[PDB]
Design a protein around this nucleic acid. Structure first.
Lengths: 46, 275
RNA sequence: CGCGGGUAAGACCGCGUGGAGGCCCGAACCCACUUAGGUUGAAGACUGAGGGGAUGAGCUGUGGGUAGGGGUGAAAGGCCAA
RNA sequence: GAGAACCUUGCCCGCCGAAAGACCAAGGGUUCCUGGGCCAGGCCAGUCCGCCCAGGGUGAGUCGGGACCUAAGGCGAGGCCGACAGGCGUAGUCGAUGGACAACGGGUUGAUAUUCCCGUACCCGUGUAUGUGCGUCCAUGAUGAAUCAGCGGUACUAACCAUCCAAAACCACCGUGACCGCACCUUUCGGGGUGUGGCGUUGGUGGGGCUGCAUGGGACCUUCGUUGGUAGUAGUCAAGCGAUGGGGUGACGCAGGAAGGUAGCCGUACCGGUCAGUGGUAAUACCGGGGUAAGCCUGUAGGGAGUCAGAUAGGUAAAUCCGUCUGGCAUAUAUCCUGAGAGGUGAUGCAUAGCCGAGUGAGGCGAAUUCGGUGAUCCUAUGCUGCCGAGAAAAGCCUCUAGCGAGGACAUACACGGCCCGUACCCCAAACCAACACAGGUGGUCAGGUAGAGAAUACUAAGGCGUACGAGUGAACUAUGGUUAAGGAACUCGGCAAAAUGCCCCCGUAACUUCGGGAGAAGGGGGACCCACAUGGCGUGUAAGCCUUUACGGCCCAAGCGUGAGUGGGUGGCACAAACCAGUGAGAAGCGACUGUUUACUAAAAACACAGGUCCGUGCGAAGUCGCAAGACGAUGUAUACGGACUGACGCCUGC
RNA sequence: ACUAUAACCAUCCUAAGGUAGCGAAAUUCCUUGUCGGGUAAGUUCCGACCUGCACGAAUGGCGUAACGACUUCUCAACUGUC
């Protein structure tokens, strides 16, 4: 059998590829954060 | 020499290995070894620019001295001759009478304990280095520089040797390994002799895995690909591409040397193919 | 490599050490050839019996990289979050 | 308890036992413990619960991390490149999956423990006191290093010994740049071109000198080394720290034993106990114990290592350190380093088999603890020996000077400081990934016994479970096992599925062959138990004995323990590889040389790859490629190398 | 010298008109070609004949020991496949 699901959770990899300090790094990312603030999201980034 | 394996296994039937006869030591000099991590043919962008590269065995860089200008008149003795993974020919480790240790490519016929003097007044026995001005016309040299003071660039492989055809003005006309005749400034150094491991070309690896050790990876022909992947692709059955042969990026077969190059004026004549 | 034979030296042949191999049989491990069941299932791709490799072009953890007319591809239009 | 198959307690039965046991990492986040609840959830009911509520619980100088270090990689001061956006990248600074670094055994709560407590250690710093104990001034050593000159040639200078090559022109031969008549091919003949001719120069080839090219030296001023004085006079110089610098070490692959050990396991000396209502069995039989670490001593098996002196600028300065060259002395079981293990200590302690009352259970006492046999996938071992595919960096430790320096080093005793995060619980699962309390997935560490070659397989010890719908009932029928008379592929698209062979030891093995194979070919024989050979053989090894350079010695060895294989005789059954586990074999053809890869989820192949062959391109920030450009891979490679194309071992070949 | 065949010759044309080797082939429509082996009976299988619809020399030709969860046929043993 091979039941390996797509999502294998991990915390260092999550904050390293969807994290805040990555989001603010690039121009597009700062737009993502500024966008979700306008929508009112409680959790701006992952 | 070349040692041929006995047919104990199908992967080993026709195989043969380099009879490591000239090797004297099995460990490099610690201070002259620097790290070297494989890239896999992928440039700084991350993409793969040259295909069929990867895998391979981890190897470390032995600092080879192609800049023999510092030591002029300080003799050395060939301490050992050992095996280099990176390059095709062996390398000899020189113990300078000064006290400094250096690595050079091992020229043909070199033996441990021989003396190697480099300089303008050095002799013309194999291993010595002296600028092309002092080398008698017609001899056989290797590791020839290209610019006056830029390092050895021509004829560095195994069994490959340049023959200095003559001198004229401030230019020495060499016969390159490829058979092409090229002029080079007479201020640049060269090393006398051929290069070791003349029997490298006769090695028969014998199996697919052995070239995977050496760092190569499988190469897929064109006529098997699909029309997107390769211009030869497609066709129901077996085809020969249905077109004049091209590289996978569409460029047809033909001479690719960029015309009108600054270094063109030096080249006396280019190599001849098929004659 | 050693011993003996063999010879002028050889070639080569027998006996000892040595233990090479994309070598052999076979569990862990990795695959997925046949069959039967499942087929509003235990499971949105599995189970039971057999099966191939199993010191290598092996399998695996950790961290990282390549991004859409682009990547990657031992090449099937396959893979890039069912 | 109102209510019980499902909750609790006890006694039986059964299942896993390389796991369905024990400990982790990732992941989850209060699920952990105590008290309480039973409209929600649990595929039923539930007094129970991983559910709901309240309270409690996670203790570190030594463990996994940070405060120490780097790899792949990311970010990147300046910077370069780019209309703008932005792309790369140096200096650095991050980044463990790696390097370096100091703790072990026992006990305790309802929940934590290498964290608390008990006993014993280790590693960084601070202060005080005690001496030892060398110094700076003071003085010792401080005598002695620099200079004046000579010698004798490094040394631009002028030049010479002059030289490698032929710098440059000279000449000629050949060849022919144009051109000029003409010689030739000539077109069938003429033309016409070429220049086989004239030079000459598209030019090439050769010759010697002209001398040049660069090359040093001999060697001159200069510069310096040596020697001769000049003051054992001016410097120097001395405790101790000593780098951000130099240098060693850190520092490395795969395969394979052999050897020595230990952990574990199996008996026994010895100690404590049982009579398990059966035919026999009182100590003769049976059951249970037959333990204990880090550290500190000692340095065994094994492995490794030459030492001393002088000179020397190569190590961005200087070095007494590292190199390299000279000499001397060295083959010793000499010396030194490393180092499993045995032995002592730690340990008058701890703990345990059991014995007492006491009962949720608290508490008290507590015996013997020798010899062997077997034996590792663990330790010596980052070792040794082979092989080619040639096998990270930095901090750390040591050393060297540069440099700081008048105080500083060593030991003893005492008193102190040692930071931040994690720490409960599940962790091959009803607590993570799968929408579920899901037959799927999930990396690492422990490995008992008897058969066995084995981590397979069967049973089983410690431990853990009976896993959450049941109770019955010989229907058809479906699924999963089992058996079958006579026949044996007649079944069918096809021996699909089943059945059959199956292990160990002997005997014997064909065509073909690339001389390796084919081959476990095929085919044939034996296999249990008891006794005897046998107080034998073999391993081990104690007493005794021998020997020594006497010690953690070497050889040998009755007894003791363990153990095959064979021969002869005998007994039993239908059956002796008795269960489980465990090749079907042979003949021929096509395709593909082979081992491998492929359509995750209907196609594993005759497809792809493959070692081998050839062709084309590339003279070097190459050709090719990613980018508008810088830049990068190619490659820290150089035509015996690199990229592209087609064919696909090997043999005979590859026609027009 | 009877039949057929076509060695041989002639023609046109092209750049040249298929050499070796193999051949009812993973290519052959006719087609279950014909002859032989195997079976009581063989549209499949093996060996050859060549009349190659429409093989052929690196889109390689002919062979080939060993290897194959490849395709095809036969045999021994085995059996509820029958």
């Amino acid at each position: 059998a091979k039941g390996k699901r797509t999502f294998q959770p991990n915390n260092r990899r999550r904050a390293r590829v969807h994290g805040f300090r990555l989001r603010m790094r690039t121009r597009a990312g700062r737009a993502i954060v500024a966008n979700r603030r306008s929508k009112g999201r409680r959790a701006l980034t992952a | 020499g070349i040692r041929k394996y006995k047919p104990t296994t199908p992967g080993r039937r026709g195989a043969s290995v380099s009879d490591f006869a000239e090797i004297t030591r099995s460990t490099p000099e610690k201070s002259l070894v620097r790290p070297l991590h494989g890239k896999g043919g992928r440039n700084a962008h991350g993409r793969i620019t040259t295909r069929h590269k990867g895998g391979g065995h981890k190897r470390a860089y032995r600092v080879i001295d192609f800049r023999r200008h510092d030591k002029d008149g300080v003799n050395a003795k060939v301490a050992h001759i050992e095996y280099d993974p990176n390059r095709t020919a062996n390398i000899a480790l020189l113990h300078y009478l000064d006290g400094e240790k250096r690595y050079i490519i091992a020229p043909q016929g070199l033996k441990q304990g021989d003396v190697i003097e480099s300089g303008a007044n050095a002799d013309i026995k194999p291993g010595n280095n002296l600028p092309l001005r002092n080398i008698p016309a017609g001899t056989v040299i290797h590791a020839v520089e290209l610019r006056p003071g830029g390092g050895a660039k021509l004829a560095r492989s195994a069994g490959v040797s340049i023959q200095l055809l003559g001198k004229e003005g401030t230019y020495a006309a060499l016969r390159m390994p490829s058979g092409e005749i090229r002029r080079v400034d007479v201020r640049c150094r060269a090393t006398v002799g051929e290069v070791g491991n003349a029997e490298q070309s006769n090695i028969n690896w014998g199996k697919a895995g052995r070239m995977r050790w050496k760092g190569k990876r499988p190469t897929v022909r064109g006529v098997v690909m699909n029309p997107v992947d390769h211009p030869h692709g497609g066709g129901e059955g077996k085809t020969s591409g249905g077109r004049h042969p091209v590289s996978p990026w569409g460029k047809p077969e033909g001479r690719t040397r960029k015309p009108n190059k600054p270094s063109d004026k030096l080249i006396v004549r280019r190599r001849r193919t098929g004659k």
